[PDB]
Amino acid sequence: YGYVRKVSGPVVIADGMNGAAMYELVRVGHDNLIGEIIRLEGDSATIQVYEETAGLMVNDPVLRTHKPLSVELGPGILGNIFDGIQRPLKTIAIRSGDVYIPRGVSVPALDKDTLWEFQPKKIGEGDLLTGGDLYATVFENSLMQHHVALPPDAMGKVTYVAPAGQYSLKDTVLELEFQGVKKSFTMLQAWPVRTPRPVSSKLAADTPLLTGQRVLDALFPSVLGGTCAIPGAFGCGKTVISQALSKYSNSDTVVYVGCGERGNEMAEVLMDFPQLTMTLPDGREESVMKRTTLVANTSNMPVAAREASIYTGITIAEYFRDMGYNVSMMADSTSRWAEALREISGRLAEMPADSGYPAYLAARLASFYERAGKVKCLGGPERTGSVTIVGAVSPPGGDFSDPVTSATLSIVQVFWGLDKKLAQRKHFPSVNWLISYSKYSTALESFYEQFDPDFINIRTKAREVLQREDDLNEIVQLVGKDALAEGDKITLETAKLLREDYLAQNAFTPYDKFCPFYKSVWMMRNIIHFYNLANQAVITYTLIKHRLGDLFYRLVSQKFEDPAEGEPALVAKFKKLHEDLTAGFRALE
Amino acid sequence: GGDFSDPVTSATLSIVQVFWGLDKKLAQRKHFPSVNWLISYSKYSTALESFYEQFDPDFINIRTKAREVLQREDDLNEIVQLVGKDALAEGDKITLETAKLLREDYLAQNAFTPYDKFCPFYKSVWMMRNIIHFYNLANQAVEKGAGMDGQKITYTLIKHRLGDLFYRLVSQKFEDPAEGEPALVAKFKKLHEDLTAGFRALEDETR
Amino acid sequence: LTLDEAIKTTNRRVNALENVVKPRLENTITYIKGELDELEREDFFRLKKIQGYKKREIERQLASS
Amino acid sequence: VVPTVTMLGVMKSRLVGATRGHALLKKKSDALTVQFRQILKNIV
Amino acid sequence: LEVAMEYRTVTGVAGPLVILDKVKGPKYYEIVNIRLGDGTMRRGQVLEVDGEKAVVQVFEGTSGIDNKFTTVQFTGEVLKTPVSLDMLGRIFNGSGKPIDNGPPILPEAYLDISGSSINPSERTYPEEMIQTGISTIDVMNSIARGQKIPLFSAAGLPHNEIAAQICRQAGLVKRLEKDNFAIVFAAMGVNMETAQFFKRDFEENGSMERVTLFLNLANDPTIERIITPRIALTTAEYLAYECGKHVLVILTDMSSYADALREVSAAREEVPGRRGYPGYMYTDLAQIYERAGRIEGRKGSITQIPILTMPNDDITHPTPDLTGYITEGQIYIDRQLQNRQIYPPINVLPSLSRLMKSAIGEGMTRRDHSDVSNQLYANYAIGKDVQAMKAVVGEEALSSEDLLYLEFLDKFERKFVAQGAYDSRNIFQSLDLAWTLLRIFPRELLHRIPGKTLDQYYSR
Amino acid sequence: PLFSAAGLPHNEIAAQICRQAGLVKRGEEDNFAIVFAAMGVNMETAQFFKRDFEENGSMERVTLFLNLANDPTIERIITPRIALTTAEYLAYECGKHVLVILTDMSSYADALREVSAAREEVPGRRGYPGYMYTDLAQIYERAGRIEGRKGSI
Amino acid sequence: PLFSAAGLPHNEIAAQICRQAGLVKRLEKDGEEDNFAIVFAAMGVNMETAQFFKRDFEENGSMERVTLFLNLANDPTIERIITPRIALTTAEYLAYECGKHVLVILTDMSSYADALREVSAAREEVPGRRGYPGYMYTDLAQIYERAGRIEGRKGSITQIPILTMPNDDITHPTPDLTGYITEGQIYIDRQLQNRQIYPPINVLPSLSRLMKSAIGEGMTRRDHSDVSNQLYANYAIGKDVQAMKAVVGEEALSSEDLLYLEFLDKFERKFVAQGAYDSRNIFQSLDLAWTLLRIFPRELLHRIPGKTLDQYYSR
């Protein structure tokens, strides 16, 4: 019930919708075009329709949905591929057979006829349960067990519990009554993208995001449930860091979110993920897709879907965190999302602000980024998850002055700063140490000292060495290495060794594909301790340089060792090398 | 006074085939025809190939050489604005001399006197050929390097001991068209012969 | 002597001239986009408001008849 | 200076030219410094 | 089976628009034919509809229309262009009506323009190279079947000559690796004189069985200039994914297309967007471009080389800056090179392809492609720097290597880039020329070249 | 005010000033009561403020008006109004001197810009409302000493 | 139109022109009809300026000749959009239908553009550049194109509408349109005023389309065009030389550069400057210009032809 009255491009006016609500999604026309309500002036409505509105007919029916832009969560959310508006691309392609996306597809987000193995918890048929209680878990696939949380805003004494067995989402797995009225819940939960997910308490982040790369792990650490920023426009560093996060990061899940980038780039990345495979610490070999969800909205996709992809991804990440899993979101191109928002604002004729973006761009970016953090779960049993966002930025020409870049730098705690200059100089990590920073180091210092009380001092010494590296750089630039003192020469040599041996990774090489934090810490110790032990001896720089050739080779090889030997063997080898270097530095003095 | 971003200007340049872009800077310097030769263009240069070939089968090459000379001079004007003509070599110096001669002789026209009231195509092409031939011969001479100096020494040699040809070149604009083509053509052919005598007589004693 | 002169010129260009020009470019960009572009939208927005008011007045007058 | 699109283009061109000239002058100064170092070594 | 009603209720004419009075159940983007009082015929498109109202934008202008003698006969359609396999080898007008003195197309299908987007799951990374015959493109800025590479130009620069050369010389590199190549050629808002140039080039090309010249003049109605690239993209999509044929598309002067969209948007009383261009221009250009790509389920592909004019000879203009993000490359035409009388004035050093690595490989093209490309890049840069230094150091103090780089720069500018307008060059002989230029330096001097390649080719 | 770009320790400076605030003493009942407005602060900054204020032991004389970035943008405009009204009541109507603190005034400016752009009002420089001077006056122009009363803001 | 900015003495030079304007033909020119019968129309003028003009006209003995239509700033704004039209109608009647040469001084045309802006805004019309009415060009054409000699009558109308750029620019719509329409442009530069030269007229931006018609051997020295075109070129090239020497140092300049700088100094000091009550005969002005030119050698005088050089290079 409801018929269109005026169709001016994307904007659509439909009469007979007195009961419509603002921002309630609606189905327009026989083709089931999907659009969101904007203005409810009079008894009429106003809808902007995402897909092309060409060919609409006046008095074509309009069908309400009684729900805002929402995502159907539950089993089967992992692995698949979804559009910006939560449209399963893979199943759409299989059903329609052809390649083109049909104008008005109506495939449900998750297949409601597929069977998943279900088994309840030890709860009783007449017990009491509340919102967020974990009443069952499901083996969606191997090694990615999926907990079934009773939806929030739903509570009451238990009435029926489905016994363990094979079931589908259409089955009524749960039924309960709060008052005399009883409600039955399936395995599918719908939640609006704009509304965040209910939380019990925002904890303080207390565990680093071990990305497997030494430069990010030690120099500029990032904590679980913490924002991150990447100036990714070239050098494939964004692809490299995304692959590292998918394969080696501590997160139990990853939710890539791609909006408004080049279509072939998304093709390349979405073909790269299935090829990516990660080995289990127990020796098993798995596929990253078994723990990966992908929301990709190319430029050809409607602008509104491009804007909504980010919120869809963050809501998916929050739902994953609802069962205490550590999940990491990855916004492919926030600049593209901002451009989509700008286009939408221009469609709405909103008053332009700085550089043309709407005045709420900073506010909306902050609202999105504020959802990341380590959070106590809702409902029992007690557990805690985390959601960390590693959303990248694409400043125009590298000038960190655009409002998107400025707001992101103002909100994001940790900025890693990939540099194209290092990429030109053949640097695999490509992380510019001169601009990167980790504002969460003060909070992470508790764990840093618990693991090793000397590690934080080593990090401070390394930061001082990096600061003096540029000083020695202009020193050599203006007068040359001749004017450098023995201590200055030792400091410069140690800085160069750190840059070319530990601060840089080798990625492609099997020995340096993954850098454990243990190996990173031992390498940092074997570098800094040797640097000091050589420093206080000032001894002729040439003499120590000649007599430390074996020590220099050991320091260089302190990163060539493969992780095959494991932590106990590599740690012992690094300790022996450090002791030998200390003996050589002290005895020869 | 307004850049090409003007909507009328952009619309015209999106359609118009030949742009005689006059520059206000040339108007300040009182260069009266005032066409800026860096920003102007003519997309008809390809269709006129037959007419240029039949009139003079070597005009295209001399025109391209003149364009290259003008572009090179405009290019190193910025460098001179920083360092100065001290580092200018023989080739650069001769290129700038030829560019200045082309700018003040060829590209100017009074139009208030019979010298420049109406320049027929033959007179213009003869001026262009004379200037380009002088440039090419001078470049070849300074590249010869005879007399153990050549180079800018040979440039000064041709600008001092051979400067009468230079003055006749810079005054060639005054060939009165009323004298008729058979007379002006003979005069320019004689000037070309005299120019060929130079840079060969100058090379006789090896500078 | 020549190196001193060249270094003085280079340092002056790096410090004074470029850092003089770049603020000028930023101010020129801000004056055009920050003001003229904003005014153009505001002028057109007020014009559209005038048109909407005229249409609403015409409709109300017709309805009152 | 008066702000205009043509003025913005002129200022951008001036900045580009200044950067190019600065690079050229830096190269010249480096060459002169190398020659001066060689002369000092020869004198020593 | 329904004969569309021919309403005669014109109740307002203004500019290009005509407002009908009491149309019963219109369609938003319907297409309507107008029979004026004098009997002449005009075709118009339907813009925003309302209660019984329908604003119609009329082609060919609206002169002579009267509110009591003009009939507006609807159709109930959305401009399904006629599409067939025999559409190749013929020149078409802006709206699709053939102008090659031939018959109208007998269609194998009526595909609606602005086709539905490709499922991103079904895309596949582009592979293999597409030979263009221009050395600067196929050596240092290689092109792969499936890219969307702009050709940024400016007013006065010979963009159309490069367009014609690409249209003629385009071919498949895989000739030596061991004919399904079609070139949908679209030209929007060309000048009146370049129309003769295009007609001549496509009337004596020698490979007419490949090209299809959709042509839209400047004085043709604007809405034709909007529809022309969409018609071309639809025909290319059909010939690629519905006929299994590799397809290349050249869009000429999409800045004119942007201006046409600007003209249409203003007529609908919409507020102008940033810098005058509508805000939806990003969506429009993304819609035009993203139709390319390689489909896993089909053996065909679409590769775009859209030619864009950058006004004021700068990239800050909204159209080039906007299309920079969507695409993955930039092949600039430099004004100074045109002044230097190098016929292809492609500034190779500024130019780059964001995914040129896919075209370079072993199976496709030749093994030494990446090495020679990088060596040429680096050596050109060095030569430019050395020329700049020689402008200020007097050139007497330059070392031997400086003179080597100077002569290499001169040779590269005057023998490699300056390809003739008709000197078709296969990639193999283009690389042979590159090696000819490279072999001047000592074998040990080419630092960027990896081992086992110098020994193979440096011996000539 | 304190002028300090993003990322600078101005929050730490504000916390140190509030915790160490006191009269010249050259009295405790009329001593400095601090009204601490917080317009558009991050959650981590909010927890830091709460913990730092609870640690100094001066909770007995400090009021926090916290408004996170999650809260609605219009609700941020009334936070300084409420904070200054409570300060006015404490100082003039009760006597004790009040040391009003508002963090991230640029967040308040952004809230004003968003609200004005919502209603499509006449824009000043940088798209800000043309009455921003008056609003910043109605916020700032309340500090001072009234003759008949011993308070001070 | 005299282009000026706020603070520059455009009113003073206008009064000087009013007091000094006269015929030149063979230096021969009662002349009551030759008396220019100045019609002065002031729009939006500070009362001090009106008092100044009144006193100057009274003192110069022209009180029986001049005519003043005043629209002071405190006076209603709308009357400023009628005052110049009234003045031009009165000038037309005094010249064409009465045979008197007439001179008109419209003052502060920007104060007329402001009235146009106020009227257009009060009507909710579509704005143009900077919010000015889209038809400002038509109004400016209507207000300027009402001057010029007419074949059938012995009269004439010559107007000097002074203009005030808002921020001392030219891209502003009003000075831009005035430059488009009017056949001339006299530029008064802030740089000259800062250097304390009473006539700050920058001779390089200046332009007169009908300059080639007024001059000539029949009414001026034969070298006038040459002299002007050479001084302009030397001043422009010398300014470029000074700009170059500002960065390369006074030492790096050549002999020609030093000659150009000396020419600039003596041109801006001895030539441009003139007394606030002292005129200069056109032949005296040409003599001064020739003294300025003769700094350079005969070779450097490229624009001047040898025929005029022989009669003037020595004198």
Is the separation of the CB atoms in G155 and G100 below 8 Å?
Answer: yes
Per the annotation, does A228 bind a ligand?
no
- How many angstroms separate the CA atoms of G283 and G267, rounded? 17
Judged by DSSP in three states, G86 sits in helix
| Pair of tokens at residue E416 | 């490699």
In terms of Cα–Cα distance, which of G241, G259, G255 is closest to G295? Answer: G259
Integer Rg of chain E from CA: 25
Residues of chain E positioned with their CB less than 8 A from the CB of D23: 388
Give the dihedral of Cα atoms B60, B65, B67, B70; nearest 10 deg.
-160
- How many angstroms separate the CA atoms of E278 and G221, rounded? 60
Binary contact (E397, D28; C-beta < 8 A)? no
DSSP assignment of F68-118: ETTS-TGGGTHHHHHHHHHHHHHHHTT---B--EEE-HHHHHHHHHHHHHH
Is the separation of the CB atoms in A138 and A173 below 8 Å?
Answer: no
Question: Residue G276: exposed, middle, or buried by beta-carbon count in 10 A (0-12, 13-18, 19+)?
Answer: exposed
Integer Rg of chain A from CA: 28
Number of H helices, E strands in chain C: 3, 0
Per the annotation, does A480 bind a ligand?
no
DSSP assignment of A311-341: HHHHHHHHHHHTTT-EEEEEES-HHHHHHHH
- How many angstroms separate the CA atoms of A2 and A35, rounded? 14
The residue count of chain D comes to: 44
- How many angstroms separate the CA atoms of E164 and G47, rounded? 70
- How many angstroms separate the CA atoms of B123 and E456, rounded? 57
DSSP assignment of A519-577: HHHHHHHHHHHHHHHHHTT---HHHHHHHTHHHHHHHHHTTTS-GGGHHHHHHHHHHHH
In terms of Cα–Cα distance, which of E400, E407, E399, E459 is closest to E437? Answer: E407
- How many angstroms separate the CA atoms of G298 and G309, rounded? 8
Binary contact (C47, G131; C-beta < 8 A)? no
Instruction: For residue G5, give how far its alpha carbon lies from the nearest alpha carbon of chain C (Å).
Output: 20
CA end-to-end span of chain G: 36
- How many angstroms separate the CA atoms of G203 and A320, rounded? 77
Which residue in the block uniquely carries the two structure tokens 């086709």?
E115
The one-letter amino acid at E47? L
Is the separation of the CB atoms in A405 and A395 below 8 Å?
Answer: yes
- How many angstroms separate the CA atoms of A61 and E198, rounded? 48
Q: What single-letter DSSP state applies at residue A223?
A: B
| Pair of tokens at residue A245 | 């996060």
A379-408 burial by CB neighbour count: b if 16+ within 10 A, else e? beeeeebbbbbbbbbbbbeeeeebbbbbbb
Give the dihedral of Cα atoms E208, E251, A100, A294; nearest 10 deg.
140
Cis peptide before E82 (omega within 30 of 0): no
Residue G310 contacts D where some CB pair is shorter than 8 Å: no
Residues of chain C positioned with their CB less than 8 A from the CB of A355: 33
Residues of chain C positioned with their CB less than 8 A from the CB of E269: 48
Interface of G with B in 262-301 (CB under 8 A): none
Judged by DSSP in three states, G236 sits in helix
Give the dihedral of Cα atoms E352, E357, E362, E363; nearest 10 deg.
-100
Is the separation of the CB atoms in B56 and E328 below 8 Å?
Answer: no
- How many angstroms separate the CA atoms of F45 and E48, rounded? 51
The DSSP bridge partners found for residue E273 are E276
- How many angstroms separate the CA atoms of E27 and E78, rounded? 9
Binary contact (D6, B5; C-beta < 8 A)? yes
| Pair of tokens at residue G60 | 């110069």
Instruction: For residue C48, give how far its alpha carbon lies from the nearest alpha carbon of chain D (Å).
Output: 27
Overall resolution, Å: 4.0
Q: How many CB atoms lie within 10 A of CB E73?
A: 15
Please give the backbone phi and psi of residue E73, each rounded to the nearest 5 degrees, phi first: -90, 115
What pairing do the DSSP bridges indicate for beta strands E31-35 and E41-49? Answer: antiparallel
Can you give the three-state secondary structure of chain E, one letter per residue?
A: CCCCCEECCEEEEECCEEEECCCCCCECCCEEEEECCCCCEEEEEEEEECCCCEEEEECCCCCCCCCCCCEEEECCCCCEEEECHHHCCCEECCCCCECCCCCCCCCCEEEECCCCCECHHHEECCCCEEECCCHHHHCCCCCECCCECCEEECCCCCHHHHHHHHHHHCEEHHHCCCCCEEEEEEEEEECHHHHHHHHHHCCCCCCCCCEEEEEEECCCCHHHHHHHHHHHHHHHHHHHHCCCCEEEEEEECHHHHHHHHHHHHHHCCCCCECCECCCCHHHHHHHHHCCCEEECCCCCEEEECCEEECHHHCCCCHHHHHHHHHCCEECCECHHHHHCCCCCCECCCCCEECCCCCCCCCCCCCCCHHHHHHHHHHHHHHHHHHHHHHHHHCCCCCCHHHHHHHHHHHHHHHHHCCCCCCCCCCHHHHHHHHHHHHCCCCCCCCCCCCCCCHHHHCCC
Please give the backbone phi and psi of residue F144, each rounded to the nearest 5 degrees, phi first: 155, 180
Give the dihedral of Cα atoms E293, E295, E300, E305; nearest 10 deg.
0
Instruction: Quote the distance between the C-alpha of residue B77 and its chain's center.
Output: 16
B5, B43, B71 member nearest E339 (Cβ)? B71
| Pair of tokens at residue E86 | 């025999």
Give the dihedral of Cα atoms A87, A89, A95, A96; nearest 10 deg.
100
- How many angstroms separate the CA atoms of G96 and G205, rounded? 33
What pairing do the DSSP bridges indicate for beta strands A253-259 and A326-331? Answer: parallel
Is the separation of the CB atoms in A162 and A148 below 8 Å?
Answer: no
| Pair of tokens at residue G88 | 């031009």
Per the annotation, does A237 bind a ligand?
yes
Residue D21 contacts B where some CB pair is shorter than 8 Å: yes
- How many angstroms separate the CA atoms of A224 and A328, rounded? 8
Instruction: Quote the distance between the C-alpha of residue E248 and its chain's center.
Output: 9
Binary contact (A351, C37; C-beta < 8 A)? no
- How many angstroms separate the CA atoms of A130 and A192, rounded? 21
Residues of chain E positioned with their CB less than 8 A from the CB of D29: none
In terms of Cα–Cα distance, which of B116, B120, B206, B201 is closest to B165? Answer: B201
The DSSP bridge partners found for residue A228 are A414
Give the dihedral of Cα atoms E412, E417, E423, E424; nearest 10 deg.
100
Residues of chain C positioned with their CB less than 8 A from the CB of G127: 43
Is the separation of the CB atoms in G175 and G3 below 8 Å?
Answer: yes
Residues of chain E positioned with their CB less than 8 A from the CB of A346: 273-274, 278-280
Number of H helices, E strands in chain D: 1, 0
A472: left (phi over 0), alpha (psi -120 to 50) or beta: alpha
Per the annotation, does A238 bind a ligand?
yes
Please give the backbone phi and psi of residue A576, each rounded to the nearest 5 degrees, phi first: -65, -40
CA end-to-end span of chain C: 94
In terms of Cα–Cα distance, which of G35, G7, G39 is closest to G161? Answer: G39
Judged by DSSP in three states, B128 sits in helix
Is the separation of the CB atoms in E232 and E186 below 8 Å?
Answer: yes
Q: What single-letter DSSP state applies at residue A380?
A: S
A7, A264, A347 member nearest E28 (Cβ)? A7
Give the CB-side neighbour count of residue F145, counting CA atoms within 13 A. Answer: 6
Number of H helices, E strands in chain A: 16, 29
Judged by DSSP in three states, C49 sits in helix
Among chain E residues, the shortest Cα distance to D26 is held by E389
Which residue in the block uniquely carries the two structure tokens 């100077």?
E406
F36: left (phi over 0), alpha (psi -120 to 50) or beta: beta
- Asked if D touches B (at least 3 Cβ pairs < 8 angstroms), the answer reads yes
In terms of Cα–Cα distance, which of E459, E187, E184 is closest to E309? Answer: E187
Element (H, E) at C24: helix C18-31
Per the annotation, does A233 bind a ligand?
yes
- How many angstroms separate the CA atoms of E155 and E338, rounded? 12
Question: Residue A448: exposed, middle, or buried by beta-carbon count in 10 A (0-12, 13-18, 19+)?
Answer: buried
What pairing do the DSSP bridges indicate for beta strands E301-304 and E293-295? Answer: antiparallel
The residue count of chain F comes to: 153
Pick the residue of A51, A90, A99 with the most E CBs within 10 A to test the interface with E by mutation.
A99
- How many angstroms separate the CA atoms of G71 and G83, rounded? 7
Q: In chain G, which ranges are continuous DSSP H helix?
A: 10-20, 47-59, 83-95, 110-122, 136-144, 173-181, 190-194, 211-214, 224-248, 255-266, 282-293, 306-312
Instruction: Quote the distance between the C-alpha of residue E450 and its chain's center.
Output: 36
Among chain G residues, the shortest Cα distance to D4 is held by G171
Integer Rg of chain G from CA: 22
Dmax (CA) of chain B: 62
Element (H, E) at A275: helix A263-275
- How many angstroms separate the CA atoms of A519 and E112, rounded? 61
Judged by DSSP in three states, A276 sits in coil
Instruction: Quote the distance between the C-alpha of residue E234 and its chain's center.
Output: 14
Gaps after residue numbers in chain C (C–N over 2.5 angstroms): none
Binary contact (D18, C21; C-beta < 8 A)? yes
- How many angstroms separate the CA atoms of F68 and A231, rounded? 27
- How many angstroms separate the CA atoms of G303 and G226, rounded? 6
- How many angstroms separate the CA atoms of E331 and E348, rounded? 8
- E strands present in A340-420: 373-376, 384-389, 392-393, 414-415
Is the separation of the CB atoms in E425 and E419 below 8 Å?
Answer: yes
Residues of chain B positioned with their CB less than 8 A from the CB of G179: 1
- How many angstroms separate the CA atoms of B52 and A299, rounded? 50
Cα E79 to Cα E224, E227, G62, distances in angstroms? 12, 9, 78
The one-letter amino acid at A253? T
Instruction: For residue E385, give how far its alpha carbon lies from the nearest alpha carbon of chain D (Å).
Output: 9
**Residues contacting residue E231 through CB under 8 Å, at least 6 positions apart:** E81, E92, E95, E96, E113, E186, E214
Q: How many CB atoms lie within 10 A of CB B114?
A: 11
- E strands present in chain B: 18-19, 41-42
In terms of Cα–Cα distance, which of F33, F25, F149 is closest to F92? Answer: F149
In terms of Cα–Cα distance, which of A234, A244, A275, A289 is closest to A513? Answer: A244
- How many angstroms separate the CA atoms of C44 and A438, rounded? 46
Instruction: Quote the distance between the C-alpha of residue A283 and its chain's center.
Output: 26
Cα A487 to Cα A476, A490, A534, E11, F115, distances in angstroms? 14, 5, 8, 91, 60
Gaps after residue numbers in chain B (C–N over 2.5 angstroms): none
Instruction: Quote the distance between the C-alpha of residue C35 and its chain's center.
Output: 4
Judged by DSSP in three states, G52 sits in helix
Question: Residue A303: exposed, middle, or buried by beta-carbon count in 10 A (0-12, 13-18, 19+)?
Answer: buried
- How many angstroms separate the CA atoms of G239 and C3, rounded? 29
Angle at the Cα of G37 from the Cα atoms of G32 and G40, rounded to 5 degrees? 170
Per the annotation, does A235 bind a ligand?
yes
- How many angstroms separate the CA atoms of B145 and B152, rounded? 10
Judged by DSSP in three states, G42 sits in strand
Instruction: For residue C38, give how far its alpha carbon lies from the nearest alpha carbon of chain A (Å).
Output: 7
In terms of Cα–Cα distance, which of G116, G105, G118 is closest to G70? Answer: G105
B1, B2, B84 member nearest G252 (Cβ)? B84
Dmax (CA) of chain C: 94
Angle at the Cα of E290 from the Cα atoms of E236 and A49, rounded to 5 degrees? 110
- How many angstroms separate the CA atoms of A410 and A405, rounded? 8
The DSSP bridge partners found for residue A102 are none
Residue G311 contacts B where some CB pair is shorter than 8 Å: no
Interface of C with F in 44-63 (CB under 8 A): 45
DSSP assignment of B21-49: -B-HHHHHTT-SS-B-TTT-EEGGGTTTH
- How many angstroms separate the CA atoms of F121 and F127, rounded? 10
